[PDB]
Amino acid sequence: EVRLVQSGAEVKKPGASVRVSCAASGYTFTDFDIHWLRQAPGRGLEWMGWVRPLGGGVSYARQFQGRVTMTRDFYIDTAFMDFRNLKMDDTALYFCARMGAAREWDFQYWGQGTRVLVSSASTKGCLVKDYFPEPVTVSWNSHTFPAVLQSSGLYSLSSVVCNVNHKPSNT
Amino acid sequence: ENLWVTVYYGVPVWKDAETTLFCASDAKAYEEKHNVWATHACVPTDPNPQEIHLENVTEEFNMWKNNMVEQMHTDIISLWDQSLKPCVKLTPLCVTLQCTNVTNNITDMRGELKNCSFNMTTELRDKKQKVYSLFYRLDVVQINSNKEYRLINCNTSAITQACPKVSFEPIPIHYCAPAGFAILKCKDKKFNGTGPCPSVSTVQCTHGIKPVVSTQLLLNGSLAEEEVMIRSENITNNAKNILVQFNTPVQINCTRPNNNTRKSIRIGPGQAFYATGDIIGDIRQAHCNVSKATWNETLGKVVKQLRKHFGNNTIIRFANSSGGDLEVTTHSFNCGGEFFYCNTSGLFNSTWISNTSNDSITLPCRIKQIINMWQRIGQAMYAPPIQGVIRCVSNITGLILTRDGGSTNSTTETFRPGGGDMRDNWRSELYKYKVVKIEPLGVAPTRAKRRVVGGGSAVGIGAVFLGFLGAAGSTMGAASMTLTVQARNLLSGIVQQQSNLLRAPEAQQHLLKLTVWGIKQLQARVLAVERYLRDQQLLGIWGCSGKLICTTNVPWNSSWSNRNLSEIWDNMTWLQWDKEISNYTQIIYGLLEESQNQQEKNEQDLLALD
Amino acid sequence: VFLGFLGAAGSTMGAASMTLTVQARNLLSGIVQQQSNLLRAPEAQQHLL
Ligand SMILES: *[C@@H]1O[C@H](CO)[C@@H](O[C@@H]2O[C@H](CO)[C@@H](O[C@@H]3O[C@H](CO[C@H]4O[C@H](CO[C@H]5O[C@H](CO)[C@@H](O)[C@H](O)[C@@H]5O)[C@@H](O)[C@H](O)[C@@H]4O)[C@@H](O)[C@H](O[C@H]4O[C@H](CO)[C@@H](O)[C@H](O)[C@@H]4O[C@H]4O[C@H](CO)[C@@H](O)[C@H](O)[C@@H]4O[C@H]4O[C@H](CO)[C@@H](O)[C@H](O)[C@@H]4O)[C@@H]3O)[C@H](O)[C@H]2NC(C)=O)[C@H](O)[C@H]1NC(C)=O
Ligand SMILES: *[C@@H]1O[C@H](CO)[C@@H](O[C@@H]2O[C@H](CO)[C@@H](O[C@@H]3O[C@H](CO[C@H]4O[C@H](CO[C@H]5O[C@H](CO)[C@@H](O)[C@H](O)[C@@H]5O)[C@@H](O)[C@H](O[C@H]5O[C@H](CO)[C@@H](O)[C@H](O)[C@@H]5O)[C@@H]4O)[C@@H](O)[C@H](O[C@H]4O[C@H](CO)[C@@H](O)[C@H](O)[C@@H]4O[C@H]4O[C@H](CO)[C@@H](O)[C@H](O)[C@@H]4O)[C@@H]3O)[C@H](O)[C@H]2NC(C)=O)[C@H](O)[C@H]1NC(C)=O
Ligand SMILES: *[C@@H]1O[C@H](CO)[C@@H](O[C@@H]2O[C@H](CO)[C@@H](O[C@@H]3O[C@H](CO[C@H]4O[C@H](CO)[C@@H](O)[C@H](O)[C@@H]4O)[C@@H](O)[C@H](O[C@H]4O[C@H](CO)[C@@H](O)[C@H](O)[C@@H]4O)[C@@H]3O)[C@H](O)[C@H]2NC(C)=O)[C@H](O)[C@H]1NC(C)=O
Ligand SMILES: *[C@@H]1O[C@H](CO)[C@@H](O[C@@H]2O[C@H](CO)[C@@H](O[C@@H]3O[C@H](CO[C@H]4O[C@H](CO)[C@@H](O)[C@H](O)[C@@H]4O)[C@@H](O)[C@H](O)[C@@H]3O)[C@H](O)[C@H]2NC(C)=O)[C@H](O)[C@H]1NC(C)=O
Ligand SMILES: *[C@@H]1O[C@H](CO)[C@@H](O[C@@H]2O[C@H](CO)[C@@H](O[C@@H]3O[C@H](CO)[C@@H](O)[C@H](O)[C@@H]3O)[C@H](O)[C@H]2NC(C)=O)[C@H](O)[C@H]1NC(C)=O
Ligand SMILES: *[C@@H]1O[C@H](CO)[C@@H](O[C@@H]2O[C@H](CO)[C@@H](O[C@@H]3O[C@H](CO)[C@@H](O)[C@H](O)[C@@H]3O)[C@H](O)[C@H]2NC(C)=O)[C@H](O)[C@H]1NC(C)=O
Ligand SMILES: *[C@@H]1O[C@H](CO)[C@@H](O[C@@H]2O[C@H](CO)[C@@H](O)[C@H](O)[C@H]2NC(C)=O)[C@H](O)[C@H]1NC(C)=O
Ligand SMILES: *[C@@H]1O[C@H](CO)[C@@H](O[C@@H]2O[C@H](CO)[C@@H](O)[C@H](O)[C@H]2NC(C)=O)[C@H](O)[C@H]1NC(C)=O
Ligand SMILES: *[C@@H]1O[C@H](CO)[C@@H](O[C@@H]2O[C@H](CO)[C@@H](O)[C@H](O)[C@H]2NC(C)=O)[C@H](O)[C@H]1NC(C)=O
Ligand SMILES: *[C@@H]1O[C@H](CO)[C@@H](O)[C@H](O)[C@H]1NC(C)=O
Ligand SMILES: *[C@@H]1O[C@H](CO)[C@@H](O)[C@H](O)[C@H]1NC(C)=O
Ligand SMILES: *[C@@H]1O[C@H](CO)[C@@H](O)[C@H](O)[C@H]1NC(C)=O
Ligand SMILES: *[C@@H]1O[C@H](CO)[C@@H](O)[C@H](O)[C@H]1NC(C)=O
Ligand SMILES: *[C@@H]1O[C@H](CO)[C@@H](O)[C@H](O)[C@H]1NC(C)=O
Ligand SMILES: *[C@@H]1O[C@H](CO)[C@@H](O)[C@H](O)[C@H]1NC(C)=O
Ligand SMILES: *[C@@H]1O[C@H](CO)[C@@H](O)[C@H](O)[C@H]1NC(C)=O
Ligand SMILES: *[C@@H]1O[C@H](CO)[C@@H](O)[C@H](O)[C@H]1NC(C)=O
Ligand SMILES: *[C@@H]1O[C@H](CO)[C@@H](O)[C@H](O)[C@H]1NC(C)=O
């Protein structure tokens, strides 16, 4: 019944310094170290840092020195990761995992993950209306295809079997 | 030709297992010291300690899984709660404070000290009183030119004040094993963390370890010999800490130059709270001074050894703390009754690569009075103020480092000092020890057979006895020559009144009652009796009640071992013998218990039956 | 045909006297499968308790 819960997907312009939360449950949180791993769509998993709950000790990777900082809170059994001065190359999915009971470099428990995309696009953003960001809600009278990424960054799609609600417009 | 099973009592065969150790510590004074580590509850060791050197014994132990560190750990933590429980509780001190910065010329001096007046209770319930005190910046937080301040622990945990009389000074305490158990002490100067120790001895209680809580630098520890040691569970894995042991001590001088004063303001009937009064003299920072020539020289010893694991020519840099609470980030240590917190950035900024003023290094140290030792939840201690100026001088004997990691390899290596846990402070001293239980019932085949059922001397100067468990590395024949040596020590004190003889003094445990070691002793003396009477009960069914060596009529099966009598007794230790027969030792104990000695009873009396 | 511990309590005095090591094993320590003394060996069970 042990599971790690991460924060939600967030979008930010370069230099925005996002923080992510990792909720622990089902076990004694103050025992095992928490690790932050990031995976790009065309790259393998990458290890960022580990922070243990008792004393907050943390070891950060060479390339993330001065860029990332991790802490935690015992009362909420949650470890946080502050990633300052984010860059266009650093857009990927962020996972927080816990080492297995064998104490070797293996991960037995993970989290659902958070989506962090860095880009320069306006927040405001059948045939589709420019609905940036990507999430849309298509419905017929109150077969859907994936979206396409243009050079401007706006997402276009199509739905064939409308009045699709837009989160930036709040219709 | 015909081989029969033989029972031996007192064979030097031991197995490692976890048992509840007790305490041993020399009596420094008849006395009110009330040292927290012991209230004199640990019974005093004999003036002369007996250490036995074992010949041809290669017993290895694992430092990281060593069970002795966790027992002490839970021992100090239990000892602290037993000392703070009788002290007064500062539950009424969680009151909105109105603080004014202490008299100081602001040049930036950014004094952490505050001067706060609060409405405190008094001896009478209806009456109150407006008294003032002084608190550092780390003890108070802002609650939304005096403004409202709140004590840091009020929102999270209750607080209790340490009794003024108890002293936090570390004293040596030895841990011994109960009767019927043994402790093996490695004497290898170049001993690695985990692995075989070619020269092993045995001792009843370990040399006393001064329990010193230190976060970044080990204090007043045991010096290494020759080259400094770099003990680690896995040097390649960064998660495990890197424990170091020094061969030359590095002296450190710490002071609190502020001449504080103690003000006892009665806050309850029979209860008195101790607050800081007017500070006499200049406002100064707490600082620690370490000589740079010696620190530069020692740091050069640690960096030389580290290259063996990572290569001759690689970049070995030292860095600062990379994060964590105030505990891990600074050199948190206690002195004179208060708790310093020293930034060690000046010690750990250096870069070493390949080869090729005389002023001391000074450390800005903060001081805090409200602390939660060992990151415990729901608890907090307020250390009372220490009147007058205090000085500290200790020896630095070890560090706790960390691997930086990263994607790049063989380009640069940086070590960041850290104090993640207090257990690593005990592994730095219990590394050379291991707990084993001795098992004295070793069976072996011999052509000797039981005296027929129908049937019915050297006086001394035996040579070169080896002491207790000394024959563990000698041949089975030579080891079988000394059986009364172990049988003496299976029960009661192994040496010099080791345990049972000690528990005789009055009011030692009566006053102690169940506090601390009092329950440790009962579990150690009852388990001793239960293991001794277990072997005697095993004999009672097996015959051989009063005999150290008995031969009874039981055939030795050839499938248990195909080795002949000579090769077994010519060049084998009882330890190696117990390993091969371990698979069949339980069956032998079943055939020999009834078929060997109860068939006799049913036949022996039938023989005389009417 | 051994009867186990106290199995000969309903048999004759002669038949019951045939099994005496059965009880003598069980008078002290665990009667069966590490029943008591073998169990109290794990650490921090009673110390914490
Ligand atoms: C006569 O006999 C009858 C039969 O035995 C008795 O009936 C029994 O009654 C008891 C209660 O008295 C029931 O226990 C409770 O069942 C609840 C429902 O169980 C669900 O989950 C079960 C297991 O699911 C876990 O493991 C499975 C795999 O096995 C896994 O797939 C799943 O994801 C999960 O990890 C599942 O088997 C059931 O079918 C159900 O799906 C269960 O929720 C209860 O747990 C509560 O309460 C208990 C007791 O108080 C706590 O010990 C638990 O920690 C948890 O308490 C929660 O609230 C607390 C407040 O103090 C928190 O402190 C806890 O942390 C916790 O909060 C939860 O959520 C957090 C957020 O994520 C987590 O972090 C925490 O971990 C917690 O999950 C409890 O088990 C029996 O189920 C029921 N029997 C049967 C057969 O159903 C009858 O009572 C007897 N008669 C009498 C008079 O007594
Ligand atoms: C911080 O770090 C510092 C170091 O940087 C730490 O300081 C060090 O602390 C340790 C203790 O932990 C001290 O060790 C003690 O040293 C003394 C002195 O030893 C010298 O004198 C011995 C006796 O002298 C004889 O001769 C003189 C005249 O010449 C007579 O006056 C005497 O009466 C004697 O007859 C002598 O034997 C010693 O020889 C040593 O050195 C030679 C090489 O020179 C070696 O080969 C020897 O093996 C030996 O090492 C030396 O000359 C010792 O005397 C202390 O030992 C005694 O006391 C112990 C406690 O009671 C006891 O257990 C020992 O058995 C021993 O008692 C013996 O000697 C007594 C006196 O003669 C007898 O009465 C007794 O019956 C028995 O025979 C101990 O070794 C360090 O010296 C000290 N460092 C310095 C520089 O001083 C500091 O503690 C650290 N702080 C921390 C960690 O908090
Ligand atoms: C040992 O450990 C220490 C402490 O971790 C390390 O030092 C940190 O180092 C930096 C400089 O590298 C210190 O600088 C502080 O910067 C603060 C904020 O500015 C930062 O961000 C801005 C942009 O927002 C940048 O322009 C700026 O350059 C910084 O990057 C200031 O607010 C700090 O002032 C603080 O102290 C004064 C009183 O002294 C207060 O009045 C202020 O309110 C504020 O508290 C300061 O200038 C920082 O102090 C150090 N702390 C941190 C946060 O880590 C060492 O590098 C490390 N190693 C060694 C060898 O010493
Ligand atoms: C930290 O602050 C402390 C005060 O809170 C300092 O304590 C002071 O220490 C000095 C000596 O170093 C004492 O002086 C002695 O006083 C006695 C008695 O004084 C009598 O005479 C004086 C006038 O000379 C008078 O004021 C007194 O009331 C007495 O009538 C003399 O006999 C000695 O010769 C010597 O002068 C101070 O008395 C003492 N203060 C207190 C309040 O007791 C302490 O020294 C400071 N820390 C450090 C490291 O210096
Ligand atoms: C110590 O306790 C005493 C009371 O025993 C405090 O004195 C009281 O301080 C309060 C403000 O905190 C005064 O309240 C005043 O109320 C009027 C309205 O009635 C308001 O207009 C004022 O602005 C103010 O809020 C109160 O009159 C005063 N005196 C009393 C109750 O006799 C004292 O401040 C406390 N000191 C501390 C907490 O440091
Ligand atoms: C008990 O009280 C203490 C003192 O107020 C709390 O400590 C502080 O808690 C805050 C979060 O509530 C920590 O984060 C802060 O967040 C704000 C919002 O972004 C930010 O502006 C601050 O600069 C700060 O990051 C804060 O670091 C922390 N400070 C200390 C010294 O501990 C504590 O959380 C309270 N605990 C409970 C259980 O109420
Ligand atoms: C710490 O203070 C002690 C004194 O309390 C210093 O010891 C002195 O060392 C010098 C030589 O370096 C001797 O001449 C003095 O006689 C020693 N003092 C005494 C009382 O014997 C020690 O050197 C200081 N160390 C540091 C690192 O500051
Ligand atoms: C630890 O101590 C070092 C000094 O030895 C501090 O370095 C300075 O902090 C000041 C802010 O008051 C900065 O302006 C300096 O730049 C820092 N030094 C360096 C070399 O950059 C360091 O900040 C301290 N860190 C902590 C957590 O106390
Ligand atoms: C570690 O020591 C070095 C010097 O060896 C310090 O370097 C200083 O760097 C500044 C520029 O940032 C120079 O202006 C100083 O003159 C240098 N120091 C000296 C003594 O010349 C470095 O800052 C130190 N780091 C820490 C954390 O203490
Ligand atoms: C046993 O130890 C002795 C020294 O006590 C040594 O002389 C002898 O060679 C050793 N024999 C074996 C087999 O280890
Ligand atoms: C007080 O500090 C200020 C800082 O600018 C300094 O200029 C002044 O000379 C100092 N005066 C005294 C009396 O300490
Ligand atoms: C409030 O500030 C004044 C001036 O600094 C001080 O005299 C007083 O003692 C402070 N506390 C109160 C009024 O409780
Ligand atoms: C002293 O430290 C410096 C680096 O800070 C180093 O270059 C020098 O070699 C050290 N001294 C000695 C005698 O090694
Ligand atoms: C020094 O490095 C050389 C070349 O790699 C190597 O042959 C030698 O064993 C090293 N010596 C020491 C003391 O590490
Ligand atoms: C030895 O005794 C075992 C039973 O303990 C039996 O199975 C075996 O046949 C006997 N003989 C030999 C030669 O192993
Ligand atoms: C049995 O003992 C004899 C004489 O020591 C020896 O030569 C022979 O190799 C041994 N064989 C076995 C199987 O132990
Ligand atoms: C044991 O030692 C004897 C010499 O005393 C030697 O002949 C024999 O080969 C050795 N056997 C083993 C296993 O060491
Ligand atoms: C012990 O018995 C096991 C099988 O239960 C066997 O695999 C092992 O090799 C035996 N070891 C010895 C030393 O007899």
Q: First-to-last CA distance in chain B?
A: 38
The pair of structure tokens assigned to B495 is: 């040496």
For ligand 6, mutation pick of B156, B326, B366 (most atoms within 8 Å of CB): B156
Radius of gyration in angstroms for the set of CA atoms belonging to chain A, rounded to a whole number? 19
* Category of B530 on φ-ψ map: left (φ > 0), alpha (ψ -120 to 50) or beta: alpha
Burial of B9 (0-12, 13-18, 19+ CB in 10 A): buried
Inter-chain touch B74–C48, beta carbons under 8 Å? yes
A27: distance to nearest CA of chain B, Å?
Answer: 16
Q: How far is the CA of B50 from the centre of ligand 2 (A)?
A: 20
Measure the CA angle with vertex B576, ends B575 and B580; round to 5°: 120
Q: Are B36 and B404 in contact (CB under 8 A)?
A: no
Whether B contacts A, i.e. 3 or more CB pairs less than 8 A apart, is: yes
Rounded Cα distance between B338 and B136, Å, is 12
Whether C contacts A, i.e. 3 or more CB pairs less than 8 A apart, is: no
For ligand 10, mutation pick of B55, B475, B573 (most atoms within 8 Å of CB): B55
Q: Are A114 and A7 in contact (CB under 8 A)?
A: yes
Rounded Cα distance between B361 and B422, Å, is 26
Q: Are A114 and A9 in contact (CB under 8 A)?
A: yes
Of the candidates B436, B435, B434, B432, the one whose C-alpha atom is nearest the C-alpha of residue B193 is B432
Rounded Cα distance between B549 and B419, Å, is 54
Q: Which chain C positions have a beta carbon within 8 Å of B596's beta carbon?
A: none
Q: Are A6 and A111 in contact (CB under 8 A)?
A: yes
Q: First-to-last CA distance in chain C?
A: 43
Q: How far is the CA of B342 from the centre of ligand 7 (A)?
A: 21
Rounded Cα distance between B353 and B83, Å, is 50
Q: Which chain B positions have a beta carbon within 8 Å of C29's beta carbon?
A: 530, 534, 537
Element (H, E) at A99: strand A92-99
Of the candidates B329, B483, B464, B451, the one whose C-alpha atom is nearest the C-alpha of residue B402 is B329
Interchain contact B593–C (C-beta under 8 A): yes
* Category of B372 on φ-ψ map: left (φ > 0), alpha (ψ -120 to 50) or beta: beta
Of the candidates A124, A41, A138, the one whose C-alpha atom is nearest the C-alpha of residue A146 is A138
- Three-state DSSP at B427 gives helix
Bridge partners (DSSP) of residue A68 are A83
Binding-site residues, ligand 10, Cβ < 6 A? B 55-56
* Category of C16 on φ-ψ map: left (φ > 0), alpha (ψ -120 to 50) or beta: alpha
Using the Cα atoms of residue B466, residue B468, residue B472 and residue B476 in order, give the sign of their dihedral. Answer: positive
Using the Cα atoms of residue B233, residue B235, residue B241 and residue B245 in order, give the sign of their dihedral. Answer: positive
The pair of structure tokens assigned to B358 is: 């005389």
Q: Looking at chain B, how many residues does it have?
A: 610
For ligand 11, mutation pick of B103, B104, B105, B109 (most atoms within 8 Å of CB): B105
Rounded Cα distance between A118 and B464, Å, is 81
Rounded Cα distance between B287 and B346, Å, is 12
Of the candidates B161, B162, B127, B133, the one whose C-alpha atom is nearest the C-alpha of residue B149 is B133
Rounded Cα distance between A29 and B125, Å, is 43
Q: Are B178 and B21 in contact (CB under 8 A)?
A: yes
Burial B263-276 (b: 16+ CB within 10 A, else e): beeebbeeeebbbb
Q: Are B273 and B93 in contact (CB under 8 A)?
A: yes
Distances from the Cα of B408 to the Cα of A90, A170, B417, angstroms = 18, 47, 21
Using the Cα atoms of residue B603, residue B606, residue C2 and residue C3 in order, give the sign of their dihedral. Answer: negative
Distances from the Cα of B567 to the Cα of B347, B564, B572, angstroms = 60, 6, 8
Rounded Cα distance between B287 and B534, Å, is 60
Q: Are A122 and A157 in contact (CB under 8 A)?
A: no
Q: Are A125 and A131 in contact (CB under 8 A)?
A: yes
Distances from the Cα of B313 to the Cα of A76, B228, B229, B354, angstroms = 46, 20, 20, 5
Q: Are A90 and A118 in contact (CB under 8 A)?
A: yes
The pair of structure tokens assigned to A49 is: 């840092």
- Three-state DSSP at B61 gives strand
Bridge partners (DSSP) of residue B333 are B214, B340
The pair of structure tokens assigned to B89 is: 């509780």
What is the residue type of B199? S
Q: Looking at chain C, how many residues does it have?
A: 49
The pair of structure tokens assigned to B54 is: 């074992």
Strands (E), B467-573: 549-555
The distance from CA B388 to its chain's CA centroid, rounded to whole angstroms, is 33
The pair of structure tokens assigned to B535 is: 């072997």
- Three-state DSSP at A45 gives strand
Partner-chain residue, chosen from B523, B537, B540, that has the shortest CB–CB distance to C29: B537
What is the residue type of B476? M
For ligand 18, mutation pick of B580, B583, B584, B586 (most atoms within 8 Å of CB): B583
Experimental method: X-ray
Residue C17's contacts (CB-CB under 8 Å, 6 or more residues apart) are B602
Q: Are B468 and B14 in contact (CB under 8 A)?
A: no
Rounded Cα distance between B222 and B398, Å, is 9
- Three-state DSSP at B603 gives helix
Interchain contact C19–B (C-beta under 8 A): yes
Of the candidates B211, B513, B265, B219, the one whose C-alpha atom is nearest the C-alpha of residue B385 is B265
Q: How far is the CA of A77 from the centre of ligand 1 (A)?
A: 20
Task: Tell me whether strands B370-371 and B195-197 are parallel, antiparallel or unpaired.
Answer: unpaired
Q: Which of B152, B322, B341, B410 is the mutation pick for testing A, counting most A CBs within 10 A?
A: B322
**SS3 of B379-416:** CCEECCCCCCCEEEEEEEEEEEECECCCCCCCCCEEEC
Partner-chain residue, chosen from A52, A75, A105, that has the shortest CB–CB distance to B420: A52
The pair of structure tokens assigned to B424 is: 């690593």
* Category of B57 on φ-ψ map: left (φ > 0), alpha (ψ -120 to 50) or beta: beta
Give the number of other Cβ atoms within 10 Å of residue A121's Cβ: 15
Q: Are B22 and B175 in contact (CB under 8 A)?
A: yes
Q: Are B202 and B183 in contact (CB under 8 A)?
A: yes
- Which residue on chain B is closest to C45 by alpha carbon? B20
CA atoms in the 13 A half-sphere facing the CB of B40? 16
Q: Are B69 and B426 in contact (CB under 8 A)?
A: yes
- Which residue on chain C is closest to B599 by alpha carbon? C18
Rounded Cα distance between B49 and B230, Å, is 30
Rounded Cα distance between B549 and A148, Å, is 89
Rounded Cα distance between B485 and B501, Å, is 18
Partner-chain residue, chosen from A54, A56, A59, that has the shortest CB–CB distance to B404: A59
Partner-chain residue, chosen from B74, B527, B541, that has the shortest CB–CB distance to C21: B541
Q: Please report the resolution in angstroms.
A: 3.4
Q: First-to-last CA distance in chain A?
A: 39
Whether the bond into A133 is cis, omega within 30 of 0: yes
C48: distance to nearest CA of chain B, Å?
Answer: 9
Residue B53's contacts (CB-CB under 8 Å, 6 or more residues apart) are B187, B199, B201, B470
Q: Are B436 and B16 in contact (CB under 8 A)?
A: yes
Give the number of other Cβ atoms within 10 Å of residue B205's Cβ: 24
Q: Are B393 and B255 in contact (CB under 8 A)?
A: no
Phi/psi of residue B43, nearest 5 degrees: -70, 145
Rounded Cα distance between B113 and B99, Å, is 10
Whether B446 lines ligand 2, by a CB cut-off of 6 Å, is: no
Q: Looking at chain A, how many residues does it have?
A: 171
Q: Which chain C positions have a beta carbon within 8 Å of B520's beta carbon?
A: 47
Strands (E), B485-555: 549-555
Burial of B29 (0-12, 13-18, 19+ CB in 10 A): exposed
* Category of B533 on φ-ψ map: left (φ > 0), alpha (ψ -120 to 50) or beta: alpha
The pair of structure tokens assigned to B565 is: 């009598």
Q: How far is the CA of B584 from the centre of ligand 10 (A)?
A: 29
Q: List all residues of chain B from 73 to 112 with a beta carbon under 8 Å from chain C.
A: 74
The pair of structure tokens assigned to B457 is: 């001397």
Of the candidates B188, B173, B171, B115, the one whose C-alpha atom is nearest the C-alpha of residue B145 is B115
Bridge partners (DSSP) of residue B9 are B441
Rounded Cα distance between B400 and B398, Å, is 7
Residue A4's contacts (CB-CB under 8 Å, 6 or more residues apart) are A22, A23, A24, A96, A97, A98, A109, A110, A111
Q: How far is the CA of B13 from the centre of ligand 17 (A)?
A: 20
Q: How far is the CA of A76 from the centre of ligand 1 (A)?
A: 21
Q: Are B435 and B177 in contact (CB under 8 A)?
A: yes
Rounded Cα distance between B363 and B295, Å, is 13
Q: Are B194 and B63 in contact (CB under 8 A)?
A: yes
Rounded Cα distance between B311 and B308, Å, is 6
Residue B150's contacts (CB-CB under 8 Å, 6 or more residues apart) are B94, B96, B97, B140, B141, B142, B143
Partner-chain residue, chosen from B74, B534, B594, that has the shortest CB–CB distance to C44: B74
The pair of structure tokens assigned to B322 is: 């990379």
Listing DSSP states for B469-483 in one string gives TGGGSS-HHHHTT--
Rounded Cα distance between B404 and B199, Å, is 35
Q: Are B225 and B231 in contact (CB under 8 A)?
A: no
Measure the CA angle with vertex A93, ends A90 and A97; round to 5°: 115
Residue A90's contacts (CB-CB under 8 Å, 6 or more residues apart) are A38, A83, A116, A118
Inter-chain touch C37–B530, beta carbons under 8 Å? yes
Q: Which chain C positions have a beta carbon within 8 Å of B519's beta carbon?
A: 47
The pair of structure tokens assigned to B254 is: 């710490």
Rounded Cα distance between B600 and A48, Å, is 74
Q: Which chain B positions have a beta carbon within 8 Å of C43's beta carbon?
A: 18-20, 67, 71
Task: Tell me whether strands B160-161 and B381-382 are parallel, antiparallel or unpaired.
Answer: parallel
Rounded Cα distance between B341 and B287, Å, is 10
Q: Which of B325, B401, B413 is the mutation pick for testing A, counting most A CBs within 10 A?
A: B325
Of the candidates C12, C8, C6, C45, the one whose C-alpha atom is nearest the C-alpha of residue C27 is C6
Rounded Cα distance between B93 and B154, Å, is 9
Using the Cα atoms of residue B437, residue B438, residue B441 and residue B442 in order, give the sign of their dihedral. Answer: positive
Q: Which chain B positions have a beta carbon within 8 Å of C41's beta carbon?
A: 17-19
Of the candidates B212, B356, B349, the one whose C-alpha atom is nearest the C-alpha of residue B292 is B349
Of the candidates B326, B321, B328, the one whose C-alpha atom is nearest the C-alpha of residue B370 is B326
Rounded Cα distance between B442 and B474, Å, is 15
Distances from the Cα of A48 to the Cα of A113, B113, B241, angstroms = 15, 39, 19
Q: In what order do the strands lie in the sheet with B370-371?
A: B160-161, B381-382, B370-371
Rounded Cα distance between B14 and B182, Å, is 8
* Category of C27 on φ-ψ map: left (φ > 0), alpha (ψ -120 to 50) or beta: alpha
Rounded Cα distance between B63 and B69, Å, is 9
Q: How far is the CA of B5 from the centre of ligand 18 (A)?
A: 20
Partner-chain residue, chosen from B20, B527, B537, that has the shortest CB–CB distance to C28: B537
Residues of chain A that touch chain B, judged by Cβ-Cβ distance less than 8 Å: 30, 33, 46-47, 50-52, 54-63, 69-71, 74-75, 99, 105
CA atoms in the 13 A half-sphere facing the CB of B37? 21
Of the candidates A40, A83, A41, the one whose C-alpha atom is nearest the C-alpha of residue A63 is A83
- For tokens 């006892």, name the residue: B264
Q: Which chain A positions have a beta carbon within 8 Å of B315's beta carbon?
A: none
Q: Are B363 and B288 in contact (CB under 8 A)?
A: yes
- Three-state DSSP at B272 gives strand
Listing DSSP states for B159-184 in one string gives -EEPPSSS------BEEEPPTTEEEE
Give the number of other Cβ atoms within 10 Å of residue B567's Cβ: 11
Distances from the Cα of B232 to the Cα of B194, B435, B442, angstroms = 9, 21, 37
- For tokens 């240590």, name the residue: B333
Of the candidates B239, B389, B400, the one whose C-alpha atom is nearest the C-alpha of residue B331 is B400
Touching partners of C (3+ C-beta pairs < 8 Å): B
Radius of gyration in angstroms for the set of CA atoms belonging to chain C, rounded to a whole number? 16
Measure the CA angle with vertex B532, ends B528 and B534; round to 5°: 115
Q: How far is the CA of B597 from the centre of ligand 5 (A)?
A: 91
Instruction: Give the ligand at the shortest distance from the Cα of B590.
Output: 15
- Three-state DSSP at A11 gives strand
Q: How far is the CA of B387 from the centre of ligand 4 (A)?
A: 14
Residue B267's contacts (CB-CB under 8 Å, 6 or more residues apart) are B90, B92, B93, B120, B121, B122, B273
